[PDB]
Design a protein around this ligand. Structure first.
Ligand SMILES: *[C@@H]1O[C@H](CO)[C@@H](O[C@@H]2O[C@H](CO)[C@@H](O[C@@H]3O[C@H](CO[C@H]4O[C@H](CO[C@H]5O[C@H](CO)[C@@H](O)[C@H](O)[C@@H]5O)[C@@H](O)[C@H](O[C@H]5O[C@H](CO)[C@@H](O)[C@H](O)[C@@H]5O)[C@@H]4O)[C@@H](O)[C@H](O[C@H]4O[C@H](CO)[C@@H](O)[C@H](O)[C@@H]4O)[C@@H]3O)[C@H](O)[C@H]2NC(C)=O)[C@H](O)[C@H]1NC(C)=O
Ligand SMILES: *[C@@H]1O[C@H](CO)[C@@H](O[C@@H]2O[C@H](CO)[C@@H](O[C@@H]3O[C@H](CO[C@H]4O[C@H](CO[C@H]5O[C@H](CO)[C@@H](O)[C@H](O)[C@@H]5O)[C@@H](O)[C@H](O[C@H]5O[C@H](CO)[C@@H](O)[C@H](O)[C@@H]5O)[C@@H]4O)[C@@H](O)[C@H](O[C@H]4O[C@H](CO)[C@@H](O)[C@H](O)[C@@H]4O)[C@@H]3O)[C@H](O)[C@H]2NC(C)=O)[C@H](O)[C@H]1NC(C)=O
Ligand SMILES: *[C@@H]1O[C@H](CO)[C@@H](O[C@@H]2O[C@H](CO)[C@@H](O[C@@H]3O[C@H](CO[C@H]4O[C@H](CO[C@H]5O[C@H](CO)[C@@H](O)[C@H](O)[C@@H]5O)[C@@H](O)[C@H](O[C@H]5O[C@H](CO)[C@@H](O)[C@H](O)[C@@H]5O)[C@@H]4O)[C@@H](O)[C@H](O[C@H]4O[C@H](CO)[C@@H](O)[C@H](O)[C@@H]4O)[C@@H]3O)[C@H](O)[C@H]2NC(C)=O)[C@H](O)[C@H]1NC(C)=O
Ligand SMILES: *[C@@H]1O[C@H](CO)[C@@H](O)[C@H](O)[C@H]1NC(C)=O
Ligand SMILES: *[C@@H]1O[C@H](CO)[C@@H](O)[C@H](O)[C@H]1NC(C)=O
Ligand SMILES: *[C@@H]1O[C@H](CO)[C@@H](O)[C@H](O)[C@H]1NC(C)=O
Lengths: 146, 128, 111, 146, 146
């Protein structure tokens, strides 16, 4: 049985990592009903968008949502993890970020307080994540210049 | 596609200093190096030195290490991928054995091992 | 320093090979070998860009080959314009070109 | 020779499956010409979008198209099939959905009447598709908690 | 040290191919600040979008940017290279496109003059790129009809 959207937000990181598809779905099934415009097709043409800037304003909100999706898919793309929800990398874990052991992290902490504890070094980790790939780019570069 | 024009030839008696001008076109003057080489009449021709128009770093043969001064004029843009420039070569002490044919050349590739290797040559000049 | 092999010729259509070698300080191993066609007193031309590859616009009949001691350059399908003087060189990335002594003689078939 | 956009819509499922790139292209080359705005750049500035809500209305139509693309790429993403056009899964085929054999399906039926015959159980199959991955998520979970 | 956005545009193709992540980032960090709408959330509500069609006009510009991103990700998708920045294909290189050797291309040319030299045959190469996959589609087709 599945706890529902964001159900494991108070669960251990391992339990939420088991239901990450659940959190992944609310990125799409909020935006499937709005792009549908099936219940919007007939109601006063296109919900009277003439002299109603809330209609455009509403539309701009829909744009922000798909724009955020594109930000996350871009990050998964430049880290070579586009197709997968869980991917391992080559970046070693610098201990200065967090000193907690594996058992304490995955069976004693929630993703919220973890993201709060590591929000300080997120940019650095992303930099290593954008950098580390670059050594794969370079190995492919060796295969390119023969 | 590039061209390397060289200055007019002139004969000067030994003891004085001179200057050779090598004008470029048909490529990006800052992309390829500039080499100066002499063909000795009676012996084997010898490479003299090279200089980067962009980096400005110069490396000469020990046979002309403290006897040659090189200078590269700032390139003049022509196309989106073509510029024009001037390369100058100088000798401090002149002698009778300095007689021979001289040439200016450009680089082959921009990077790699064969970067400064002479590829495209000038028409040449004659000396005393 | 680099001593180019003696001048060898041959009739048109066959193949001719010229070698280049020197002391272990400028030997052909661990160095890059370049070959040039140099008519006397005229503008030279580049043939081989490194010991195993060619320059843009070089006919494939001009092939190269370098051993752990000496390097060679083979010219197949000889033609009238092949009568010229040739020189070799040794170079790296931070050094300069060290020209060989030269191989000048080349002959035509049936004159 | 290539039948053209949606050319194999009346062909056997195998033949259309050979030219799925053709149907894939009309998702992009309708929207390349509109995002181009090259023929739109000079014509009366931005096609006079002041006091013309059809211009905004038009724009909202363009938004719906890229929004639908994002729905399909999200589904390919959460099924671990982002990079490929044909991917095999771990979900076994429950016979209650269709009883037809393989030869009758791929060499006797078109994709239209197939999609019509299975539209009843599409949501269930998607649920198994979102679920089955979750066992891969769990295998990666075993590799995570060591 | 990293030359910066588009820094290696005048470098050899090999050097730019080493810093393609740098050029990849300006697709996302221009559009992260605009979708953020954090500095836009409070300034006169939604930057007064009533009676200001520049606001909508501005929004349409943001749409064109994410639309272009979707064009490139679609092309990487239909070439089976979604997850990777460097991918090798099955299409052989027809010599009529360019006669230059590998050393002259990667250590003597920049990406600009290369793209200018090959802009003539780009569509043909894309056609082989859309076609060649189709033989992979067909191999998967052999595995489908058993
Ligand atoms: C919100 O936060 C709270 C934190 O407080 C969190 O609660 C934790 O929940 C997780 C699981 O979701 C627990 O983690 C696992 O718990 C396993 C134990 O579960 C069984 O045993 C419980 C204890 O029963 C004891 O007492 C009875 C007598 O009453 C006795 O017979 C038993 O033998 C045992 O000694 C029990 O409470 C539990 O619940 C059911 O059963 C009881 C009756 O036993 C019934 O009264 C309940 O109403 C309910 O029906 C269940 O029986 C534990 O074993 C496991 O550790 C390893 O063992 C299992 C094998 O059993 C492995 O499969 C597992 O992978 C482990 O390797 C693990 O610890 C955790 O203990 C809770 N922590 C608490 C309660 O403090 C919530 O889940 C959070 N919720 C969200 C949504 O985030
Ligand atoms: C729309 O729906 C229709 C359904 O009606 C569909 O038509 C089907 O089309 C598919 C292919 O697209 C057919 O499937 C394959 O057909 C292979 C046979 O093709 C050859 O043989 C045909 C029969 O010729 C017989 O008669 C002549 C005498 O006239 C005789 O010499 C022959 O030996 C043979 O006995 C023939 O019609 C066909 O067409 C060309 O040739 C004839 C002359 O022969 C000419 O008149 C035509 O104008 C045309 O030029 C061709 O010659 C069949 O073999 C194959 O089965 C296996 O064999 C081949 C090896 O040959 C394998 O490669 C293959 O993979 C198979 O394993 C397969 O059955 C199918 O039969 C059609 N069904 C019909 C017509 O009812 C349309 O394609 C659909 N279109 C779209 C866009 O959806
Ligand atoms: C814009 O375009 C220009 C094109 O003009 C381009 O310049 C090229 O830059 C690339 C690299 O970015 C060069 O490619 C490599 O260069 C390697 C050589 O680098 C060293 O050697 C240089 C030459 O020094 C000679 O002279 C000194 C005496 O002054 C002597 O001691 C040396 O032994 C040598 O003979 C040197 O200029 C260079 O720069 C530093 O050092 C000098 C002092 O030496 C100092 O004055 C400078 O200010 C600077 O601090 C450096 O020392 C070359 O070796 C390499 O070829 C192979 O070798 C290396 C191993 O060393 C391998 O690692 C490599 O992978 C290769 O296999 C390769 O050729 C290229 O030569 C430039 N071309 C020029 C200048 O014409 C710019 O980079 C472009 N910029 C952009 C952003 O696009
Ligand atoms: C992590 O980086 C810090 C400096 O940023 C360094 O002091 C520390 O030793 C590093 N930890 C490692 C390499 O484990
Ligand atoms: C498919 O599921 C139905 C119930 O939903 C079940 O009755 C049937 O046996 C299943 N078929 C299988 C497991 O092959
Ligand atoms: C490339 O295609 C042209 C015709 O488009 C052809 O003439 C040429 O031989 C081809 N080159 C190959 C196959 O190497």
């Amino acid at each position: 049985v599945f706890l529902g959207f964001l159900g494991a937000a108070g669960s251990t990181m391992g339990a939420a990592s088991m239901t990450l598809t659940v959190q992944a779905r609310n990125l799409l099934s909020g935006i499937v009903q709005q792009q549908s415009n099936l219940l919007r097709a007939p109601e006063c043409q296109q919900h009277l968008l003439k002299d109603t800037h809330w209609g455009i304003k509403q539309l701009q909100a829909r744009v922000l949502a798909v724009e955020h999706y594109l930000r996350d898919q871009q990050l998964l793309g430049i880290w070579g993890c586009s197709g997968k929800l869980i991917c391992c990398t080559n970046v070693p874990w610098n201990s200065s970020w967090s000193n907690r052991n594996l058992s304490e992290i995955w069976d004693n902490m929630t993703w919220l307080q973890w993201d709060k504890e590591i929000s300080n070094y997120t940019q650095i980790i992303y930099g290593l994540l954008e950098e580390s790939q670059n050594q794969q780019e370079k190995n492919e570069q060796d295969l390119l210049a023969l | 596609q590039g061209q390397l024009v060289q200055s007019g030839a002139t004969t000067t008696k030994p003891g004085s200093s001179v200057k050779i001008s090598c004008k470029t076109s048909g490529y990006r003057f800052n992309f390829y190096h500039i080499n100066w080489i002499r063909q000795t009449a009676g012996r084997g021709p010898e490479w003299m030195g090279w200089i980067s128009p962009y980096s400005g770093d110069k490396n000469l043969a020990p046979a002309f290490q403290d006897r040659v001064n090189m200078t590269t004029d700032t390139e003049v843009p022509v196309t989106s991928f073509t510029s024009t420039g001037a390369a100058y070569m100088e000798i401090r002490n002149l002698t009778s054995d300095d007689t021979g044919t001289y040439f200016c050349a450009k680089g082959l590739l921009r990077d790699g091992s064969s970067t400064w290797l002479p590829y495209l040559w000038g028409q040449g000049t004659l000396l005393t | 320093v680099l001593t180019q092999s003696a001048s060898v010729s041959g009739s048109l259509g066959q193949s001719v090979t010229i070698s280049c070698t020197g002391p272990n300080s400028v030997c052909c191993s661990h160095k890059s070998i370049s070959w040039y066609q140099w008519p006397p007193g005229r503008a030279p031309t580049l043939i081989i860009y490194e010991d195993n590859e060619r320059a843009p616009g070089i006919s494939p009949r001009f092939s190269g080959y370098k051993s752990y001691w000496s390097a060679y350059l083979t010219i197949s399908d000889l033609r009238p314009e092949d009568e010229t003087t040739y020189y070799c060189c040794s170079y790296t990335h931070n050094s300069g070109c060290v020209f060989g002594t030269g191989t000048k003689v080349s002959v035509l078939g049936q004159s």
